[model samples]
Target chain A: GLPLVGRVAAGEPLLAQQHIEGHYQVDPSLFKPNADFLLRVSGMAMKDIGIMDGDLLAVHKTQDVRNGQVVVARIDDEVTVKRLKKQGNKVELLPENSEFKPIVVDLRQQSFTIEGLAVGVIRNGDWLVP
Target chain B: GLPLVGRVAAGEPLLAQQHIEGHYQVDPSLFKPNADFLLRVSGMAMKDIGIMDGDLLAVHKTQDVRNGQVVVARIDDEVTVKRLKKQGNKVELLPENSEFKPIVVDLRQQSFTIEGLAVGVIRNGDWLVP
Candidate 1:
């Protein structure tokens, strides 16, 4: 069972009991690195590439990820989903939708952490269970 | 690895060496009853329900399936994707798209078999492997 992470709290630990909405019966081996949890997408920031709102995003818990990969990250108090871009020490989180601007991270000035890698997506539909 | 069933033959065994195009790194446990192969959807008949053309449909091989369930079935020599509808002795394959008409199967008059149940779907995109 994959823990479905719902409304999260800042400064509180992710995957904590309070944030877990429910469990999805997904095989861990379905994901490459094996997913740790399912995050319910909140917005259309990544919709251009088909990551829509309310979809279950499979996440692999890890701090290590290559550039150009979609990732789940925390910047200060907010958690977000974006494509990772790294050029030497510079880091930026690029959104798929044009309406959303890329998030630039100042590692030296702000607290930041790579929570996990966006591994796969599961549509919340009857197609899977029905 | 799940065998990716491509262009299939009518009289040939369903899981024969000639029918398998390749394999996908998917865990069988991801699907209830477990998926045996990945079928590449070839038409838009099921697009209304989000099962689009070119999508890899996770199929659980079995003859036992409930009515109103989306299934993979063979009528005569042609295999098809549709929702199963059974009325006493009458059987019908209903397409999701309105443009397509339902196929009523005379089981006693023609050769018919339920190949599998459509357990899930995977979009052939970067979200899965990138």
Candidate 2:
């Protein structure tokens, strides 16, 4: 049996799928989806790394991210998603492919705004072969 | 005394004999004969620096490169090369080892290019091998 099910949105209510037997019930409030940002995952630079198209990225708003963390950033007025690496006065937004160029911030030249760190990803698709 | 001597390129004439001070009159250009870009060697991502294997990167542009920077880059069709750090931005070009997931510029979204920034390094390989 499915664990639990609940409506996701306010107006449109969908049936919840239960997991496990009937012993434990799923809590809607505890596992409630709380996503503020919606980003579409589309790129092949990371094809070799398992990130694929149609992946729904749940991004949160925050400014306190540590180094080596994945983040969504607004640079030069443009928004980009990348990994954060900081070294002294320099900050780098690196990519996954050797062909794709990295974004290096020379603190002396520009300002960077961290929109949020990637917390979770939601992928919708078929589980078994058709 | 002296070290080994050899001619490089042409139209450029030169000769060498030995080392050890018998001594050695530093060859006019014993430490010479090559350089492609005249970059100002700026940036701080690698301020706490040290790279290798994967380093030296004598970059002949045979269309080859490892990871991590100290590079010069060219983006939006501009040229730049920072430490080559790669991840999946969902395809990240990472910076150093962390704080940066790397570059996740959407491949399906835009095109990227790389230009040379560092090579042979020639960092005044010092006295204590400084």
**Per-residue lDDT over A53-121 for candidate 1, one digit per residue giving the tens place of the 0 to 100 score:** 766788999998999999998889788999999776568999988889999988887888889999777
Evaluate model 2: give its TM-score: 0.34
Q: What share of the true interface contacts does each candidate keep?
A: 0.02, 0.00
DockQ of candidate 2, scored on C-alphas against the true complex (2 decimals)? 0.01
TM-score of the second chain for every model: 0.90, 0.41
DockQ of 1: 0.12
- Give the per-residue lDDT digits (tens) of candidate 1, residues B41-64: 778788666667666778988888
Model 2: residue B45 alpha-carbon error in angstroms? 35
Say which candidate scores most in TM-score: 1
Q: List the residue pairs that clash in candidate 1.
A: none
What is model 1's interface RMSD? 5.4
| Residue B80 miss distance in model 1 (angstroms) | 11
